Design a protein around this ligand. Structure first.
Ligand SMILES: Nc1ncnc2c1ncn2[C@@H]1O[C@H](COP(=O)(O)OP(=O)(O)OP(=O)(O)O)[C@@H](O)[C@H]1O
Ligand SMILES: Nc1ncnc2c1ncn2[C@@H]1O[C@H](COP(=O)(O)OP(=O)(O)O)[C@@H](O)[C@H]1O
Ligand SMILES: [Mg+2]
Ligand SMILES: [Mg+2]
Lengths: 296, 242
């Protein structure tokens, strides 16, 4: 057993050494196990919510100043809107003003540290968070697509027929090139969407927003990438088809949003103007009229 | 003839099997001279630049580069960024000239975005580091272009994630300001069609092939229907495009 000591002392101390090296991974996974939650259960009870929670979108904004973090400045200032259920709202502004901050204020990711904000009477912040982000709809500037297949990338919750998916390809003007793919449906979108174009990736993300049948679609700058002819054609298609739907649009180009109902202008976190586009273009001192003039 | 890129009749592809991606590309790009590529969505706009690099596969056709191939500057449709500092992004293994770096970051107008960053110039951005806006990442990725003294600039679309003010600052200063100083060959894809007066040659392409190439007066005379589509589409339909 002295020969057992001289054959097993090295495995004692070397297994102690990589035991410390492997237990550093337990220390790292327990440090990352203790992260912050988002507190997905809300304040308000889940019995006041109907089937159609956003049936008529009365988005009343009152005094909504938001913040990304606790150490930062208030990004948006004291803003006020009264948004009708049949309305279509185009929000324009500079980069760094807060217009894509304002689209995240409907979904409770950017922290609403003061503000009243409601839809259909009842408070946004007093809601279940999953029922909030399930019955509402966004579309972002970034096209993020997953791997697998196109019927999964348009419908990951598996509950749809192919006719409403091809209706979403009809209202994306995507149906002709998805029929030009050699499966018809069910071919392969790769890691991040590298099988296709950037505008086709954004068109897939647009049609993935078009599967869901909620009465609120909000729109960030999706047609920053997709060109002007399909911007006009797709703007005409989503203005004829979604007639009931309260569409909020961060338009990238101002000449597709001259046909809007009323227009928010956001400069440095605050509403400068809120009226008709003909009224704010015809005022001629307004910064919306110089946004039209500086474009064309 | 003063023409660096002379791709004639290329039947290029991505996949080695199947149909080719591109077909019969008979293009010319003049030296020292800005040109623009306008097509529809998914119709070959990045694919011409990646076939001109030879990243896409040549089934048939021939490429006639002139001063092998030199170093070209390039900024993609998706902005690739290092895990380095912002100065090490924008220099990108060049000698650091302070005044040429200064007029690049004044030309891009990234100075308030470098002013709000917590170490300013030398903040280690990237994956390991601080997340960015995406528009600032687009301006950083085109700010690594137009610096290299590389004389051919393959500038794929900068004008997705930027507004009208920063794109007129990028199109009056920078593009046609310092790229008219030396004779740098700049090619652009851009759907913001107000800069179609600021183009000497114009490539218009459609579904793999090109439709035509040439100047705005040649598209005015010979093509004259997609010229009318651009005249309706830019919404300055009263004037004459020159
Ligand atoms: N990396 C790739 N691998 C395989 N096929 C591709 C790839 N990129 C594009 N394609 C195919 O080639 C065609 C050309 O797309 P491309 O990426 O050139 O679009 P684009 O016109 O440059 O996009 P945009 O409108 O954003 O400029 C598309 O129909 C697409 O299906
Ligand atoms: N992830 C973030 N963390 C902290 N601050 C941010 C973040 N994103 C944006 N901001 C700040 O919010 C302001 C408005 O940004 P944002 O709304 O995202 O862009 P835009 O105003 O172009 O729509 C910016 O000045 C920026 O400094
Ligand atoms: Mg934004
Ligand atoms: Mg492209």
């Amino acid at each position: 057993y002295a020969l057992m000591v001289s054959n097993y002392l090295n495995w004692m101390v070397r297994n102690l050494a990589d035991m410390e090296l492997q237990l550093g991974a337990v220390k790292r996974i327990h440090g990352l196990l203790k992260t912050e939650a988002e507190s997905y259960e809300g304040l308000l009870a889940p019995s006041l919510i109907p089937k159609n929670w956003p049936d008529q979108g009365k988005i009343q904004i009152q005094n909504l100043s938001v913040r990304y973090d606790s150490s930062l400045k208030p990004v948006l200032k004291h803003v006020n809107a009264l948004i009708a259920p049949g309305q279509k709202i185009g929000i324009c502004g500079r980069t760094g003003s807060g217009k894509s901050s304002f689209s995240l204020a409907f979904f409770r990711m950017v922290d609403t540290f003061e503000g009243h904000i409601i839809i259909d009477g009842i408070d946004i912040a007093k809601l279940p968070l999953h029922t909030l982000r399930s019955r509402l709809s966004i579309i972002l500037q970034d096209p993020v697509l997953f791997s697998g297949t196109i019927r999964f990338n348009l419908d990951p919750e598996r509950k749809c027929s192919d006719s409403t998916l091809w209706e979403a390809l009809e209202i994306a003007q995507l149906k002709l090139v998805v029929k030009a793919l050699p499966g018809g449906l069910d071919a392969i979108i790769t890691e991040g969407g590298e099988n296709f174009s950037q505008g086709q990736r954004q068109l897939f993300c647009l049609a993935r927003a078009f599967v869901r049948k909620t009465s609120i679609f909000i729109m960030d700058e999706a047609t920053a990438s997709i060109d002007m002819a399909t911007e006009n054609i797709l703007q005409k298609v989503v203005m004829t088809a979604f007639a009931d739907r309260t569409v909020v649009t961060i338009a990238h180009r101002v000449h597709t949003i001259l046909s809007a109902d009323l227009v928010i202008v956001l400069k440095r976190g605050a509403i400068l103007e809120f009226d008709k586009p003909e009224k704010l273009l015809s005022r001629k001192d307004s910064v919306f009229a110089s946004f039209v003039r500086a474009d064309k | 003839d003063n023409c660096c890129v002379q791709i004639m009749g290329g039947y290029f592809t991505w996949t080695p099997d199947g149909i080719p991606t591109l077909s019969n590309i008979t293009i010319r790009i003049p030296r020292g001279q800005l040109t623009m590529i306008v097509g529809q969505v998914g119709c070959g706009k990045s694919s011409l630049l990646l076939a001109a690099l030879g990243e896409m596969q040549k089934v048939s056709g021939a490429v006639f580069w002139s001063s092998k191939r030199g170093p070209v500057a390039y900024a993609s449709q998706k902005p690739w960024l290092l895990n380095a500092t912002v100065e090490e992004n924008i220099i990108f293994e060049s000698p650091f000239n302070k005044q040429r770096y200064k007029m690049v970051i004044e030309a891009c107008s990234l100075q308030p975005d470098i002013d709000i960053l917590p170490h300013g110039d030398q903040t280690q951005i990237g994956e390991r580091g601080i997340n960015l806006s995406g528009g600032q990442r687009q301006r950083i990725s085109v700010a690594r272009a137009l610096y290299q003294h590389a004389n051919v600039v393959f500038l794929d679309d900068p004008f997705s994630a930027l507004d009208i003010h920063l794109s007129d600052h990028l199109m009056q200063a920078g593009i046609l300001e310092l790229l008219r100083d030396d004779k740098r060959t700049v090619v652009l894809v851009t759907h913001k069609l107000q800069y179609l007066p600021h183009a000497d040659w114009i490539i218009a392409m459609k579904d793999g092939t090109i439709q035509r190439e040439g100047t705005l007066k040649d598209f005015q005379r010979s093509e004259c229907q997609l010229f009318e589509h651009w005249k309706t589409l830019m919404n300055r339909q009263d004037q004459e495009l020159e």
